[PDB]
Amino acid sequence: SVHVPGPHAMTIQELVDYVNARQKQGIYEEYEDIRRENPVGTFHCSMSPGNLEKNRYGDVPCLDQTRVKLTKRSGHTQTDYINASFMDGYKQKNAYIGTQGPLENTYRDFWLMVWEQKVLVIVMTTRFEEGGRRKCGQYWPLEKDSRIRFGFLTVTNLGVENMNHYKKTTLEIHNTEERQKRQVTHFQFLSWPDYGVPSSAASLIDFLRVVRNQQSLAVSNMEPPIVVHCSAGIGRTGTFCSLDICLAQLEELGTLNVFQTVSRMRTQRAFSIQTPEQYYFCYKAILEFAEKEGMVSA
Numbered sequence: 410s411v412h413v414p415g416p417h418a419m420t421i422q423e424l425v426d427y428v429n430a431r432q433k434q435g436i437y438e439e440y441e442d443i444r445r446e447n448p449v450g451t452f453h454c455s456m457s458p459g460n461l462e463k464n465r466y467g468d469v470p471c472l473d474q475t476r477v478k479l480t481k482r483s484g485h486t487q488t489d490y491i492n493a494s495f496m497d498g499y500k501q502k503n504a505y506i507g508t509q510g511p512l513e514n515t516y517r518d519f520w521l522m523v524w525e526q527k528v529l530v531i532v533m534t535t536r537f538e539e540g541g542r543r544k545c546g547q548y549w550p551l552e553k554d555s556r557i558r559f560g561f562l563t564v565t566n567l568g569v570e571n572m573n574h575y576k577k578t579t580l581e582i583h584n585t586e587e588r589q590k591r592q593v594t595h596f597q598f599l600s601w602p603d604y605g606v607p608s609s610a611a612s613l614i615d616f617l618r619v620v621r622n623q624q625s626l627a628v629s630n631m632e633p634p635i636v637v638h639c640s641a642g643i644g645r646t647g648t649f650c651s652l653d654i655c656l657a658q659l660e661e662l663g664t665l666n667v668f669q670t671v672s673r674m675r676t677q678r679a680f681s682i683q684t685p686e687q688y689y690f691c692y693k694a695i696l697e698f699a700e701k702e703g704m705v706s707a
């Protein structure tokens with residue numbers, strides 16, 4: 410895993426001084442320096458003929474080095490391509506798969522990836538459309554007992570539950586070619602605002618705990634990667650994963666490094682963290698968490 414504790418991790422105390430010394434604008438500038446970096450890797454496969462139509466955004470290709478390859482087959486007029494990247498987690502290889510919001514022409518590829526990678530949990534961070542911007546196709550059966558066939562794969566809704574900040578749906582994936590069935594939990598975070606970032610991170614951190622516990626539970630009963638996606642799979646997705654990583658390290662060693670985490674993440678899921686606001690949000694969310702945990706003195 411590229412996410413190892415340190416070198417140079419910070420304690421809550423040090424993070425406080427770090428943020429106060431730079432302020433909001435200083436953090437924005439720091440983000441702009443990360444954005445300046447020349448990507449580590451290439452995008453030849455993503456920008457090639459046949460796969461271009463498989464990207465929701467022409468300016469958001471995935472790295473060749475870390476892309477998730479589909480074990481396709483002969484003359485069916487398809488490929489092994491899907492805009493999705495393997496992402497390490499804190500001291501964990503391939504803890505996540507950051508990907509774009511599925512397109513109609515990639516629904517089957519998305520589920521083929523879920524099946525092939527033995528995914529147990531899917532995390533959706535947006536709605537189908539926000540502010541008039543399409544951000545994700547309706548790739549799963551919405552209501553209980555409804556089902557959708559994707560060739561040899563059938564997906565059935567076994568039940569939905571609406572929470573205050575997220576909705577949970579249980580799905581059954583039936584592979585008719587291998588005559589096997591699996592249960593997958595689909596989570597949709599509902600509290601990310603249409604504009605800017607969450608005013609408070611409490612909801613998102615609580616949601617993170619819900620996802621963590623469900624993955625743990627699913628794993629014990631079956632580690633497979635958690636599929637996390639947003640429109641382009643780099644903004645809210647990178648924020649969710651960067652927070653999970655830092656919080657994980659904060660729990661285990663009482664230290665963290667936002668800069669390091671985001672920089673390392675962008676070598677696996679290129680362009681992770683798309684705005685200076687989201688970068689700043691990472692720092693603020695951690696400080697807000699530390700205060701809620703009674704770790705901060707004024």
Ligand SMILES: CC(=O)N[C@@H](Cc1ccc(C(F)(F)P(=O)(O)O)cc1)C(=O)N[C@@H](CCCNC(=O)c1cccc(I)c1)C(N)=O
Nearest residue numbers: 448452466468469470639640641642643644645646680683
């Ligand atoms: C113009 C356009 O449609 N692109 C968007 C793509 C996009 C990114 C992020 C989101 C998001 F925040 F909602 P989500 O949370 O779902 O991720 C949505 C859409 C954009 O703002 N453009 C980006 C571009 C990203 C940087 N890439 C490159 O520019 C690039 C491309 C190819 C090769 C190379 I080297 C670099 C921008 N301008 O901020």
